[PDB]
Design a protein around this ligand. Structure first.
Ligand SMILES: Nc1ncnc2c1ncn2[C@@H]1O[C@H](COP(=O)(O)OP(=O)(O)OP(O)(O)=S)[C@@H](O)[C@H]1O
Ligand SMILES: Nc1ncnc2c1ncn2[C@@H]1O[C@H](COP(=O)(O)OP(=O)(O)OP(O)(O)=S)[C@@H](O)[C@H]1O
Ligand SMILES: Nc1ncnc2c1ncn2[C@@H]1O[C@H](COP(=O)(O)OP(=O)(O)OP(O)(O)=S)[C@@H](O)[C@H]1O
Ligand SMILES: Nc1ncnc2c1ncn2[C@@H]1O[C@H](COP(=O)(O)OP(=O)(O)OP(O)(O)=S)[C@@H](O)[C@H]1O
Ligand SMILES: Nc1ncnc2c1ncn2[C@@H]1O[C@H](COP(=O)(O)OP(=O)(O)O)[C@@H](O)[C@H]1O
Ligand SMILES: [Mg+2]
Ligand SMILES: [Mg+2]
Ligand SMILES: [Mg+2]
Ligand SMILES: [Mg+2]
Ligand SMILES: [Mg+2]
Lengths: 369, 378, 372, 369, 369
DNA sequence: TTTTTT
């Protein structure tokens, strides 16, 4: 009796358009959920779903001013909203969703039931997601000389693996692991490896979240921390110096809650979902404002005790007692890392550790020693 | 002489669109009053109410171009405004309201006369709002370990219940409450249980509205607690260390009046309604600017003395003077809260406490014998 | 011909649409002058007036496209502006205008030559406007408890009544009465009673109108007092502490002028009409930035000296010298007030006081002896 | 070849629509040049002018849709721009123009030749613009009470009259005047009398034109005094105390120039024409940022020394050296001025003073003593 | 097949519409190129050009709806941008372009070759462009009084004339002139003379271009000086006070480049072409945030010494050190200057000065003394 | 920063 309404009714049965909690629609195209507020794309999904429709229904969609009518009817039908990003054990890529429990990679409408609005930013590659390669053993050699597999450096290696694998889970973690070691120890190597691995779900911030107040006016580094899965806090100054700013313990207490309070510039929204694994890359032993039982409850430390030096100052660092092993610095290492070399090898290693430490239940524990 | 005008008149005779004092249009879709400031929701209602109309009238509302003519007529016929949210003892859900007087759940046109423009955000399940379940047994055990029923902890427990049961009444409360205890005592667990129970009527604000003036420029932290029924302020710092402000005594008194003054960004609205119970989750005793009788009578305190240490620091916690029980930490408890396992059990408990305490009149009372400075001035 | 033009010409002869000096179009719907700056509601009037047009004309006003044509014609017809709100002794309601000189209520065309643009927001009931009722005796008992009718408390009671009754006049007042008293003395109760009595003509603003400037950028806290007949600034803080600003005397001098300068957000209009009785509900004595003869000419004080206590702390109150009387707190009074139970009893009381203090000339006077 | 085009051509030949240099579209309707950017009013003129057209053309202008075609044609036809408000000694009303040199009143095409785009807002009544009347006799007593006609108050009275009468001239003045006196001296009464006399040619702004920067962002407190002939500022704070901002000495120099740089919200026009007499009433002597010969040549002061007091405080006022006379307060005068009682009487007085002080040349002089 | 397309093709052959590089659409009507993003210039030109077309085409251009289709086609056939305002020694008037190095005045199609997109705003009358005239005598007397021809004031008068005549050449300059002097020395008189001479090529801005960063959102104070040949920033404040700004030398660097950056409201044109001579009439010596040797290479100062006083204060000025003459003041001078009395006389003098210093090359040199 | 823009 009235087509352009049966077309809209049929489109609404595939659940390709959803209404979110923020009052704006999300569209499922190119095997991804994307937001409508930026570019109008409820249309151009009609042109895409045109082929899954009867012949006499698909001819009417080759015309503007008729797709706008269909879009109006579709918009007048979505009343109730839905919640997004509810599954913490799924890793969303740019062309599918990887299951962290089994390791299977879902594409198409299989990776649709999980309303994942975030992504790594790069596409997957199953041919590179394999154990043996002229690149996985390079990575294992790169890792094994940063945290040696000895029984002396056994629990430190365990904590290292646990933190690195926990940077995949999309859930609130209460812990503030420190990466403590002298210069040229490999901390930035791990940071760049992780950034190459998990991609866009990664953030490198400054000192201001550990020393300043969090809700005095707007806070730019709070809104971009929404739904991220790993946060690095390098560039730590010296705190043994005179009159230097100390690490605010209340800041530590505020950064482990499931919801962080703060707003960006020119915004009325004050709430954020905390999914991040905050890691502090320090060079000196951290000292805080005050020490109490509520602070020792949210801190862990990982020690880096291996130096990498050129033959120039090899023997000078040999007699140093801050290290446990000295090796030769490689110059092409950073260039190889920045070219996305060990991306999928590191991803495979992280998944292997994840389904070894957190597969019954995901949690982090403090080591106030 | 017009059929799209008769459609609009018939719709307007069902009282499904209303105009409010703030200037917005509210519609009744899916057993709830909904509105959207940026884009009106009248045409959604026109498409939804299509079935109640006769056949020749309903067949015309399948065209987007005619639902605009109908909407224009409806906008022109609505002249006078109405008052909103005038019933305190009614808890609105996404599919009806619950009467706190007797515990009956209404839907349809029985829920429409209470023009409640807020809701918890979820649907009400009848089969889970019961007192016979394993979930209720677990919840009662958890609550009885957080706040034991010993005779030396009888007043405190009662206050506890009252305060929590206050978060269901949409009226102005003239008292502020403190949740004061040491680490690992159960304050955050209570906060998360309450949030899971009452949904979108719960808000978490910033420390900034205890210590900063509330009128210089835009303050979205004040304007966001409009018609909310529970406001939590967490992580109060120590007032002795560096960079520490003090709790302004005038802000405490401002956050007890039925109307608070404060505006959001890019806005000219400077008045908000106060229906909230304000709880400050602290770890050290609060320190105020000045002390007088007007600050005496708006402050209450609840104590948390029960530790939850893992069986490694058990003896060290047994050595502390701030705890009375050192019960074992449950590791999976924080997982079966965010999954809304104890949602309706805690709802039933809150309704029971509300019936017990706030049925004649809802009113909170101060407890000034619990603060050091207040004791000195007492 | 153009029957759509004749309809506009016929509407323009009933004087139901007017153009104001600020650029607004005010229409006359349901015995009230209304306007909406963002959405001009002329088509509302076009639809609601069709019953007064002949049969052949009223049928053409059911189309939403023909109403726009009629509205465009009406817009082109109106050229000259008019001035509004020029009668200070009239009280506008949602369905008429009450004359404070003789207590007569006007409706229809009689209550239309007073081009009032503000209102209380509620209707006027003539059955609840009686002198004798149970609500009236309850209200009188409440008021005589807040301000007793003794002989030492005689000037205070007169000032109280004068201020509360002057909150009805739509003219300019030079004075800044302070409601001063200790805790639980009945200041907020009086404020809420006045709120319930006068409806939308009541506004409550922030304290920045007393301690900040009124012209650095937008200020909706001051631009919202346009044509309001009562303004409250409740619960001023203490000035003895360090870090507290003082009350600026220039802000006091600006707030007693017929026109106050200040603009809202995204607005180019900088002028407001001051019709307000400003009351500062305070618990400590005010501390000013500077004292001179020009400041003491605009300030009055009303004291509150009756405590309302729970039976527990009744004894400690009678030892305090800040109270002259102690009574029992009523737990169900604020809920009764919030339900507009005494809405018309208090209105009758205020009108009775108005035709006792302000009927020849409406003017407020300072009391410089009170402020230390 | 077109009916709605010939209509626009005839309306253009009438010379009722013009284009100013600023970019506005003034039109001549009801014996007045009017304009409104927020409310274009060419269609008002099209509808109002149909009577001066043949019958076959006037019946086509009853359609709101057909008036917009004529307006579009008219907008296309106007290529060149003209300059407005070039006569300083003409006072425009709602229904004509008054010549200040001879006292004549013009209407119709006699008042159209002076492109006066501003107005008082009210009509000129000749039955009230007379010299003998009870209103004139009351007004003379009021003014002689405020400023007595004695021999030590002669120069002050002359300066008072000069400043008040200069508010009718549409030229640029080179002085700022201070109304200095103590409390209850008659300054606000003078302001209200002048306001009721000159109507919409009067404006009141804030103190940010004196102690602030006039160029940052939108400033509608400086862009509202465009082509106005009187600007008032009132209630200056005490500057000898603390917490006060001194009067910026360069703001004084900018305000005496023929044009002032400032723009309102949502507009690009950054130049406003200065025709105004600026008067600053105050209770204390002004305190400036810096004193220089370039400042003292732009400042004049007139003093108010009559006190109006209630019968209870009269005794304590005769002992004050800030007053030279104590009259008795009239309670009903404030409401009598609000109702525009002494409007045409005060206008007659102002014109009489003007054609005594400003006929050869209009210039204002400073009093640096 | 399309009449409204053939009309647009015909109009595109007359070369009456051009597209510049920023995106401006300039049109040629009334013997002058014009552009205005607000006014509808193309639909004005379409209606004005309808006569130089066949009769069958012309009658269609009387409808405002068809004049929009023609302009829509014209905007689509304009794909290539042309460069404009390349002749620096031509002065554009309202009816033609005057050559400075030769003295001829082209008009009509003769002036269309030089795409001079700006204008003085007034027509050029040759009869008043004569060397000998009473107005020339008065003007020479005035300019000689303002700056005398003494032997010590010859290095200053040459720079005065250089910077005054450089306001006619439409090309980027490299200096910022300061007209420094005491009170009542003649700086504003020179400014008014130059304004009345060069008309619409003269713009006046605020001090925010000096003391504020000119890269924040819309900024019509910077966007207004596009292709203007003179800019004034009168009345800078004294910077040795209790809280003051500085001239922000980086702005001085940005104000000498030929592509100063700034955009107006509701527009996306950010690049403005710098053709202006920036002059600031201060009363005190300027002070900057920091001083380098690059600054003094682009700063020039000219002094004013003659004092124009009243007979009341003639004696006190003869003892002031910062003066050389105490010549008597003239009152009716400004009124004559504001009436464009010495417009063409000053124009002739400026041209005579121009063909004396800038004939080989227009360069402005600094004065660091 | 916000507000203005937009
Ligand atoms: N009844 C209970 N039985 C067992 N474990 C519990 C019980 N109640 C709470 N817990 C757990 O014990 C821990 C107590 O931590 P919280 O109460 O959330 O922290 P807290 O009280 O806010 O102390 P802070 O935040 O450090 S001042 C959490 O891991 C809870 O999940
Ligand atoms: N006549 C009355 N009889 C009994 N109770 C009263 C009466 N008037 C007021 N009350 C109650 O007594 C209490 C007094 O509180 P308020 O009226 O707010 O006094 P207050 O001056 O506002 O005190 P604060 O602390 O400065 S806000 C309230 O609970 C009133 O409801
Ligand atoms: N000629 C007059 N005869 C009688 N009363 C007068 C006269 N002129 C003014 N008044 C009244 O005297 C009172 C004081 O005059 P104002 O105009 O307020 O003086 P003022 O300069 O404004 O003093 P401020 O504002 O406190 S600094 C007002 O009530 C006037 O109505
Ligand atoms: N050559 C002249 N002969 C006669 N009068 C003159 C001459 N030059 C200027 N004047 C007048 O003398 C007065 C001097 O004012 P200006 O020169 O404009 O002020 P100024 O030099 O800018 O000093 P400022 O602006 O106060 S710091 C004006 O009224 C001029 O019209
Ligand atoms: N496993 C490794 N084998 C060889 N060279 C390494 C290895 N890890 C790091 N390096 C080199 O040693 C340097 C370590 O510095 P970096 O990782 O930045 O330490 P830090 O972050 O503590 O300064 C890097 O430049 C890197 O090229
Ligand atoms: Mg590094
Ligand atoms: Mg906690
Ligand atoms: Mg109160
Ligand atoms: Mg005054
Ligand atoms: Mg000057």
């Amino acid at each position: 009796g009235n087509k352009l309404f049966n077309i809209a009714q049929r489109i609404l049965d595939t659940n390709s358009v959803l209404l979110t909690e923020r009052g704006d629609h999300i569209v499922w195209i190119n095997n991804s959920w994307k937001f409508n507020s930026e570019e109008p794309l409820i249309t151009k999904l009609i042109l895409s779903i045109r082929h899954q429709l009867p012949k006499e229904y698909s001819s009417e969609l080759l015309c503007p001013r008729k797709r706008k009518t269909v879009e109006a009817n579709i918009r007048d039908m979505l009343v109730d909203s839905v919640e997004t990003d509810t599954y913490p054990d799924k890793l969303p890529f740019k062309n599918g969703v990887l299951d962290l429990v089994d390791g299977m990679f879902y594409s198409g409408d299989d990776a649709k039931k999980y309303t994942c609005t975030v992504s790594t930013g790069f596409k997957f590659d199953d041919t590179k997601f394999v154990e043996d390669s002229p690149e996985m053993e390079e990575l294992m050699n790169i890792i094994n000389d940063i945290q040696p597999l000895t029984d002396e450096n056994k629990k430190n290696r365990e904590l290292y693996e646990k933190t690195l694998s926990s940077c995949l889970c999309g859930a609130t973690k209460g812990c503030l692991t420190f990466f403590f070691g002298e210069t040229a120890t490999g901390k930035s190597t791990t940071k760049r490896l992780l950034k190459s691995a998990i991609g866009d779900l990664f953030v490198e911030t400054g000192q201001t979240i550990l020393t300043d107040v969090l809700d005095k006016g707007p806070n730019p580094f709070i809104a971009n921390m929404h739904l991220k899965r790993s946060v690095f806090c390098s560039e730590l100054p010296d705190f043994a110096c005179s009159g230097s700013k100390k690490i605010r313990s209340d800041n530590i207490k505020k950064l482990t809650e499931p919801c962080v309070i703060g707003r960006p510039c020119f915004s009325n929204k004050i709430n954020n979902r905390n999914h991040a694994t905050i890691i502090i890359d320090t060079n000196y032993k951290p000292v805080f404002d005050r020490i109490d039982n509520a602070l020792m409850r949210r801190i862990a430390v990982v020690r880096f005790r291996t130096h990498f030096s050129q033959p120039s100052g090899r023997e000078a660092a040999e007699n140093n007692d801050a290290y446990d092993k000295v090796k030769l610095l490689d110059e092409g290492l950073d260039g190889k890392i920045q070219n996305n070399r060990y991306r999928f090898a590191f991803l495979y290693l992280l998944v292997k550790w994840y389904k070894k430490y957190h597969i019954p239940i995901m949690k982090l524990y403090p080591t106030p020693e």
